[PDB]
Amino acid sequence: KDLSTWQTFRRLWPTIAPFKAGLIVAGVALILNAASDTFMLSLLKPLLDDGFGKTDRSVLVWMPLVVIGLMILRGITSYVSSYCISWVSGKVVMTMRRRLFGHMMGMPVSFFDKQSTGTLLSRITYDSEQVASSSSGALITVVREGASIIGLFIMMFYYSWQLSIILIVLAPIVSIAIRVVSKRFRNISKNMQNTMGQVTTSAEQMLKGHKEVLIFGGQEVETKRFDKVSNRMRLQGMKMVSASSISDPIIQLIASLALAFVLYAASFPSVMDSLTAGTITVVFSSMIALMRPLKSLTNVNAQFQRGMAACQTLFTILDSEQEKDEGKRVIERATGDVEFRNVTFTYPGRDVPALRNINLKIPAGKTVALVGRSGSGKSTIASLITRFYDIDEGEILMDGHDLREYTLASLRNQVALVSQNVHLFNDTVANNIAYARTEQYSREQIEEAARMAYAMDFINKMDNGLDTVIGENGVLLSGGQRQRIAIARALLRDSPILILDEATSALDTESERAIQAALDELQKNRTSLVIAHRLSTIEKADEIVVVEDGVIVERGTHNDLLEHRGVYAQLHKMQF
Amino acid sequence: KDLSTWQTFRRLWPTIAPFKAGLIVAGVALILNAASDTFMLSLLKPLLDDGFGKTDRSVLVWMPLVVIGLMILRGITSYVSSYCISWVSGKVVMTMRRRLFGHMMGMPVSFFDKQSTGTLLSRITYDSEQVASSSSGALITVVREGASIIGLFIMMFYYSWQLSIILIVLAPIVSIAIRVVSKRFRNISKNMQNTMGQVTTSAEQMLKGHKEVLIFGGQEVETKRFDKVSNRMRLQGMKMVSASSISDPIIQLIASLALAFVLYAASFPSVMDSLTAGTITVVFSSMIALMRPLKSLTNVNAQFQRGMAACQTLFTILDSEQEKDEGKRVIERATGDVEFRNVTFTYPGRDVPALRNINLKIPAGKTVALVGRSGSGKSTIASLITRFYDIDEGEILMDGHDLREYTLASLRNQVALVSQNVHLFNDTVANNIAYARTEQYSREQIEEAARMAYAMDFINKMDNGLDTVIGENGVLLSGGQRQRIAIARALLRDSPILILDEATSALDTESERAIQAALDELQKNRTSLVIAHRLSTIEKADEIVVVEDGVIVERGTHNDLLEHRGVYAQLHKMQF
Ligand SMILES: CCCCCCCCCCCCCC(=O)O[C@H](CCCCCCCCCCC)CC(=O)O[C@@H]1[C@@H](NC(=O)C[C@@H](CCCCCCCCCCC)OC(=O)CCCCCCCCCCC)[C@H](OC[C@H]2O[C@H](OP(=O)(O)O)[C@H](NC(=O)C[C@H](O)CCCCCCCCCCC)[C@@H](OC(=O)C[C@H](O)CCCCCCCCCCC)[C@@H]2O)O[C@H](CO[C@]2(C(=O)O)C[C@@H](O[C@]3(C(=O)O)C[C@@H](O)[C@@H](O)[C@@H]([C@H](O)CO)O3)[C@@H](O)[C@@H]([C@H](O)CO)O2)[C@H]1OP(=O)(O)O
Ligand SMILES: CCCCCCCCCCCCCC(=O)O[C@H](CCCCCCCCCCC)CC(=O)O[C@@H]1[C@@H](NC(=O)C[C@@H](CCCCCCCCCCC)OC(=O)CCCCCCCCCCC)[C@H](OC[C@H]2O[C@H](OP(=O)(O)O)[C@H](NC(=O)C[C@H](O)CCCCCCCCCCC)[C@@H](OC(=O)C[C@H](O)CCCCCCCCCCC)[C@@H]2O)O[C@H](CO[C@]2(C(=O)O)C[C@@H](O[C@]3(C(=O)O)C[C@@H](O)[C@@H](O)[C@@H]([C@H](O)CO)O3)[C@@H](O)[C@@H]([C@H](O)CO)O2)[C@H]1OP(=O)(O)O
Known part of the structure; x- marks a missing residue:
């Protein structure tokens, strides 16, 4: 049931639809903060690189107040954006819990005697919470890094289409790597949140059966069971973090292979290289700046996929068979025959x-x-x-x-x-x-x-x-x-x-x-x-x-x- | 019971003591990665800033393979460090759950009828998990940023003790701000993880009482109760994130006040300023590089304090009154009089x-x-x-x-x-x-x-x-x-x-x-x-x-x- 990411995000979207105002306010705050940061860097570069003596004293007189006000605006924009994304995350994780409660409470009796109370309770405290990370913050970060990548791609296409061919030919490779990494991430995310239900069930069995677990001895059997279950959970988390720490080197290595290719191409004293030698430095500097967006996107992919897998299984349970309610006949004070x-x-x-x-x-x-x-x-x-x-x-x-x-x-x-x-x-x-x-x-x-x-x-x-x-x-x-x-x-x-x-x-x-x-x-x-x-x-x-x-x-x-x-x-x- | 951070970290240390090998391996991996990054930057700066034509072709021939191997070493070190810190976190969060289980299971019967099963179960799935973030990763980050800050302080002291006086005079202010922010962070961290027990109890009441909540009507009272409890949890999280997003602007503003002071001091054409004009740029560049360590430390302080408060309350419950076990007289097959x-x-x-x-x-x-x-x-x-x-x-x-x-x-x-x-x-x-x-x-x-x-x-x-x-x-x-x-x-x-x-x-x-x-x-x-x-x-x-x-x-x-x-x-x- 490993659904594709886009088609389950489409189904998650209606839940976040009422809170689009928070997302748009976060976006406008982000662009305002980026503009303020660019303003600050542009005004600071002559003061730092050239020197204080080179810079005019007239502007330097008002420089402290100007920079204070500029960064105050930056900080207020950052506060607004962070509060908005957190509010969206909280309001979309609240509705998830509400729907889980209202849906599981209407389940037929024949469903409650098959499942365990612990595994049902564990989906309201852990499974629902994972959607919060991937709902707003991860989506905003992914959108921003994708926009940055597209901008750098357009810059390469305009500057030099000769050296941009390797990015085109390696895009399938990096896309396939990202896809398989994301699918695996979703796999351990679904598997690990399933064994937390085992943790909750093991805890609940001892919590609700303390009297007989005291009377009939066995002070070590429950401890051994919980130890095995906790070890299983810890090793699942270890597998997740190992996959996360493995994924980044491969994407970085693909980027460095592109770097090696472009360096080797610049090594050849070709006529095009000799005539456009200045553009080689420009494209190299532009591409060396893709490392940070690629790393950020790939790192946030782990949290995004964990939340997406939690969302997948949560909508899977939410679309179960509820109690039959076909009959619609209100009766007041029936005789009782x-x-x-x-x-x-x-x-x-x-x-x-x-x-x-x-x-x-x-x-x-x-x-x-x-x-x-x-x-x-x-x-x-x-x-x-x-x-x-x-x-x-x-x-x-x-x-x-x-x-x-x-x-x-x-x-x-x-x-x-x-x-x-x-x-x-x-x-x-x-x-x-x-x-x-x-x-x-x-x-x-x-x-x-x-x-x-x-x-x-x-x-x-x-x-x-x-x-x-x-x-x-x-x-x-x-x-x-x-x-x-x-x-x-x-x-x-x-x-x-x-x-x-x-x-x-x-x-x-x-x-x-x-x-x-x-x-x-x-x-x-x-x-x-x-x-x-x-x-x-x-x-x-x-x-x-x-x-x-x-x-x-x-x-x-x-x-x-x-x-x-x-x-x-x-x-x-x-x-x- | 808001204990000071250092004296509760001292009590947490014995739990992480068996896993010091992971921490030291993570540290050596970090210093190796930093050395590799410095090597890469030192070799890349002439190639980028000066230009490919300026650089020698002989070294540029082997440059691709050299950079590939260097970053491969960097990536393997990053993988080793991340896996080690995650392993330490997982093994210190596993022991916490083990001890909670083995301690709560030995509680007297007179303690179990006073507390609710939900609030006791919620401390093994949520309260224990919060220590994981503050145990290894937060500690390593705090140590690294403190070392960086001390290094920059020593650099200022050596370069110019005249302009470093403002940092000395503002250190009490920023320290007090960090202290009050951390205490508040611990306050909402302790308060919010306490109301998750209410969430678990509200869920458990409906999970274990489905039959009578169907029979006796009231399909809306439980929904309203859970809605109120979830709203309380969401607003607690909102308060936590609001404090987190408020804390950073104040520290940044203190740093910018120092920046304004040093700019104003450089504005005056003093004899010392005129003679040591070159050192002014050096100290300004050094201090502008403190923004990132300060921001990283203050941001990780939120997770560190949340985990520390969870640790505080967890050791508070762990030191409760267990069942009386003074008598030590083993008896086999007693008559039963x-x-x-x-x-x-x-x-x-x-x-x-x-x-x-x-x-x-x-x-x-x-x-x-x-x-x-x-x-x-x-x-x-x-x-x-x-x-x-x-x-x-x-x-x-x-x-x-x-x-x-x-x-x-x-x-x-x-x-x-x-x-x-x-x-x-x-x-x-x-x-x-x-x-x-x-x-x-x-x-x-x-x-x-x-x-x-x-x-x-x-x-x-x-x-x-x-x-x-x-x-x-x-x-x-x-x-x-x-x-x-x-x-x-x-x-x-x-x-x-x-x-x-x-x-x-x-x-x-x-x-x-x-x-x-x-x-x-x-x-x-x-x-x-x-x-x-x-x-x-x-x-x-x-x-x-x-x-x-x-x-x-x-x-x-x-x-x-x-x-x-x-x-x-x-x-x-x-x-x-
Ligand atoms: C400088 C310092 C100086 C001196 C310092 C030294 C002194 C002191 C040192 C302190 C040390 C502290 C201790 C410590 O450091 O920590 C411990 C120690 C471990 C040491 C290992 C030594 C190896 C040396 C390595 C050194 C450098 C890395 C960790 C541990 O030991 O954790 C162990 C686990 N983790 C590791 O080993 C990782 C890891 C450990 C290493 C740790 C580093 C520390 C070293 C210190 C040295 C310092 C000096 C510098 O090793 C590895 O990676 C190494 C191989 C590759 C590394 C890559 C590096 C990246 C570089 C990239 C740059 C180019 C281990 O996992 C095993 C497998 O897990 C993964 O996924 P799978 O499971 O297979 O699915 C791997 N697949 C993956 O990840 C795949 C992942 O998608 C990757 C994504 C790939 C990306 C996609 C490619 C895209 C394509 C693009 C191109 C088109 C797979 O394959 C691997 O690894 C190999 C690899 O990845 C595969 C990757 C695939 C590649 C594809 C193509 C690639 C393309 C490349 C292009 C060029 C691996 O085989 O399992 C046991 C426990 O398992 C059990 C057990 O044993 O039974 C099972 C358990 O439950 C079971 C059961 O079987 O019973 C099983 C479950 O199903 C469970 O559900 C239930 C169930 O119900 C069924 O029953 O049952 C239960 O039984 C329980 C027992 O009860 C006892 O607890 O434990 C753990 O042990 P434990 O926890 O300790 O007990
Ligand atoms: C460009 C775009 C173009 C157009 C776009 C527009 C169009 C569309 C827009 C979309 C909008 C989406 C909606 C949305 O955006 O979202 C909503 C909307 C809110 C809008 C507000 C308008 C205000 C304008 C602001 C704009 C810019 C910020 C959020 C909300 O509304 O959340 C509301 C909450 N949050 C805010 O308001 C934050 C926030 C909201 C703002 C959101 C931004 C979005 C704006 C959009 C504009 C975009 C254009 C750009 O406002 C603030 O900050 C503002 C003041 C200060 C801001 C600083 C900015 C930083 C800049 C720095 C740079 C210099 C609100 O919290 C209130 C208090 O919380 C905090 O801590 P306390 O609680 O007091 O402890 C504050 N203290 C703190 O933080 C302190 C913190 O330590 C800070 C650390 C300080 C650092 C230390 C200093 C170090 C010293 C260093 C020097 C030595 C405190 O004081 C404050 O704020 C003030 C301030 O902080 C104090 C700080 C202290 C300062 C000390 C000195 C400083 C030194 C300075 C040096 C120079 C504040 O008063 O409570 C209600 C619900 O509460 C209840 C209720 O009402 O009853 C209670 C609840 O339970 C109770 C009960 O009472 O019953 C109570 C509980 O105890 C509970 O336990 C149980 C219990 O059992 C008891 O009974 O019961 C229950 O009743 C329930 C009801 O049932 C209904 O649900 O809800 C929430 O409502 P709700 O959730 O929506 O329902």
Whole structure:
């Protein structure tokens, strides 16, 4: 996927298009600074080379103030240009991060379980930053050196076309060398920024798994892994710098070969050489001045190509497959008649389907309970209900119409659940209870929701009631308190459809039935999808469905299931 | 904590001390390259300024080959020096990451719940990298420009001490300006790399919380937060670049003020000026050549100070308080007679103690069960047993001796538990079951441990048995399978002390009692610390202890507790 530089710069250009004013101001500052420098050199040459005594004293009287003002203008122009190019770079590296965040955040769930969090995070701190160098400063430098080279080429063409033939014949050679060097530079630039994701992943694994890496020993295995990864990154950087330091000698050697050729041509006492001997010095002096522009362009090529490769891979990821959003049907306060018709779902990368012809009905104002073997089909149904994944066959109808027909935001706004592995945010308890809706819900509503979840008992025991930070993933408050806070968060939404995916997994029986009674009393005629391995919490459920290997086994009321004496009664007799 | 530059460079020096060979080779390459450049300029000046006709043809015949070889030597020296400085930079940025990893990984648990994972991870990818620029290249450039400045100062002192007085009188001014500019540069360098941690934390919060940020809406709140954080970072960078572009004009203006003074002095037709008129041109030409070294030093000062501030904060964190390791007593296969004597523990930042005079005994070959109110004292005891935290009063004795007396590695190697919030690693199932000990346990042992945990049933159903990657945090296999894998991991250790912190929290009753029977049969005479909210799984426990508000309430056998008709019987009658 090593795209050509020009055609990816063309795609990068629209991102920098709003900030063309900074670039043009930088350019006008550059030409003004060049004019001021030429003015200063022209006025300084007679004073230095000829001598102070030779120069007139009348102009020398005002010379100090004149030079002070001239260089003050030079410095202000340099400041303006540098600030403008840096501003362009910063504003084009800010938009890149914004787009990466807004695009990766809308990715489907099936994409997040394949990639690692570290390698996704490493593209917002390192991959995006590399475009900054190649966006504005490198482009301006390349344009300036190309203009200088073209000017010197025109000067050679006007002065003497006989001695300029070698530059024409070596231009393919130097162009090919620059092209292969740039392609290689992009290669290591893409490879090295990919292994920084490995660095971030290796760091994150130890950062987020400190407890078990302490408990289970292995204080050296993680160190060895990180050492190998860091050595890989360091050697990638070494390869990049070695290529950078190799590229310059070859271009310089080509230029010196041209120098040797022109010196050898001037060695021959030809009639044209003898008649145009004065022009030989002129062309030699002009060509000896190409060394600096060539060196500057070739040196800045390294940063330009690193940034260009980062841009290439960044636009590669930015054009990935996002979540499906074909359906555009806004629905407000749906009844919640979720119904399944012969839907079979298969997780990506798995040959065996997770669900086989699963069929269940969730009418309005009814609580349905799913039980069965661990890990058979339970959480998968709740995942498909909110469309975390995409169904393969069958049809899932919400309020009589297909889920794919409704817009994603409306569907997610009408479904609120308690995740099996609750991941609380590092913020205040009030902000966590009412997440992403702090401006819509008052403090009284938050307190009432917390009370409905039997969470106000331990909240007041904290240092600051409903205002205490709980750290990363809610480490501060441990165990069942996280589940109670999640229950309060789900209840505060007042969602038409509420799903309890192991609501009381880590809750004692004293508060489990209190929460169940609160749900039964304060949430009457609300569609509920309760999932639990404890049958005692679903004794009053309207109907129970048993899932085993992702298929329908037994459905009906608790008394009907007990009289059936099937799998549900087998589990109930074992639980007692 | 804005430390002075020299005294923190002194502390950074030992890190670069092993790699002094690269620096000295870079220096010798630099002096060789300078000598070659002087040779080339000396031989080229007569050819260019005087003219080709003036120069002898005999030397001009060999001139092309001579110049080719000379510049080839120049290029090879430049390559050697650049590769050496880059190698030094890379090897000094690798060690920094190694030390950060090995130091942050040994931090106490009480430090990890206060900081955010993002801000800790951001110091290994960004904070460490900044030292690379200021370690080798910036130091070499500063040394070279200082040597050049000292040489020009000596040249002025020898040539004319009358006109060198202004440099002496302005040296305090330029030194003070450089000092304040450097201190400010370090200020924004420390401030900006601190807000990159905010960038990483904001990215990580959305990366690791995608499910609930989809479910609970709020597709704009996270975007706004990240937008504000990115704007803060961009404006910090803008401030840094503005200070950088402001610093240069002031130093240049001081130099130009010296230029104006010397021009004004030469304006006066003094007797000394008239007699030494030739020396005026010499000193003016010498001083006009100081502009480039001054500009280069002042420009590289920005990168040097950014790296120096990063080094300052990095050594600040590196000298934090690590885990206590005073005790040095290696113990192999301890009996496990853990006993508590009037120990009261208080979590950091909490006024109310978590445990108040908790007292319990865990003799050899006994299983003790803890029950009670949710979140009272249960997980805290298991945390102190392995010394995740530090006790305040009382004494915890393991095998008759204090925990603090034993070395940390031996104590952790003799305790293996199942965490309440299991966090599986992104690797193969076999590697996760035997974590950090893959070289010590064979495949047969892993399979037997998995079978003991009732985990071999669903393992064979996977695409690759015991060889299938499970993604980040074990997303691939959901719910109870993670708990079964954790149980297998705990069992495979064959640890003398085994703690079950909600072992069957997310497991159905069909496999819960099977796992309990496997533990009872295959782990006879092993010290067990079982913690569960389901009394049915601890019906055969040797003794049960009830924890309520972190104090002892009721201890004894199941029959004794039932006959007591206390809190335990109150819970049992409610569970049935
Ligand atoms: C005056 C003083 C007095 C006395 C002083 C002395 C006393 C003390 C001295 C102090 C010394 C300090 C120590 C130190 O000085 O430092 C160390 C020491 C090294 C000393 C070497 C001695 C050689 C003498 C040289 C002297 C002068 C140079 C550096 C090191 O040792 O770094 C070593 C690396 N770097 C060098 O060697 C450079 C370098 C080192 C030299 C350093 C200088 C210091 C000398 C001191 C003397 C002072 C006196 C003056 O040597 C070279 O160049 C030399 C050859 C050419 C030189 C040219 C000079 C230019 C002049 C031009 C003028 C005309 C080395 O890279 C090897 C290859 O890398 C490049 O690219 P590739 O990799 O091949 O792609 C080269 N290709 C290129 O660059 C190409 C580039 O595009 C150039 C562009 C070309 C331009 C285009 C042309 C355009 C055309 C135009 C015309 C049309 C390629 O070919 C080369 O070089 C040759 C050359 O370039 C090729 C160029 C192509 C030419 C084409 C045509 C040209 C046209 C010409 C026209 C005329 C080279 O072979 O790898 C090992 C580690 O590798 C591993 C390992 O070994 O396993 C691998 C790693 O991971 C792997 C794995 O294999 O496992 C591999 C990865 O894939 C990874 O991804 C994973 C993955 O997953 C897979 O598994 O796995 C892992 O295993 C790990 C181990 O675990 C242990 O860590 O390390 C490093 O070791 P380490 O880091 O130390 O451990
Ligand atoms: C030819 C062409 C023809 C026509 C072309 C035109 C057509 C189109 C043109 C295209 C234009 C593109 C757009 C663009 O061009 O770009 C925009 C436009 C800006 C235009 C400005 C017009 C001014 C005209 C100037 C022209 C020429 C320069 C840039 C911008 O606007 O960037 C703005 C920023 N930058 C500038 O302005 C620079 C700059 C901009 C100029 C850009 C040039 C382009 C002009 C075009 C014209 C072309 C024609 C030629 O202006 C200046 O310099 C000018 C004054 C001096 C200049 C000197 C020149 C050098 C010459 C030397 C030669 C002699 C601005 O910074 C403000 C301050 O920053 C610095 O440090 P401090 O912050 O104070 O510390 C300055 N101190 C320094 O540097 C000091 C530095 O050490 C210097 C070193 C000194 C050396 C030491 C001396 C040694 C001694 C030696 C002797 C012994 C300080 O003082 C200054 O400047 C003055 C000066 O320096 C002080 C220096 C000290 C002097 C000491 C003695 C000197 C000795 C002298 C001896 C003789 C200055 O006041 O802040 C806002 C955003 O801020 C917020 C906001 O507003 O709230 C804050 C933010 O967060 C906060 C919060 O407050 O909330 C705050 C934070 O703390 C944050 O941490 C959190 C936190 O948690 C707390 O809450 O919160 C957040 O709120 C956010 C909002 O949410 C909205 O985003 O933004 C930015 O806006 P934004 O980014 O756009 O949004």
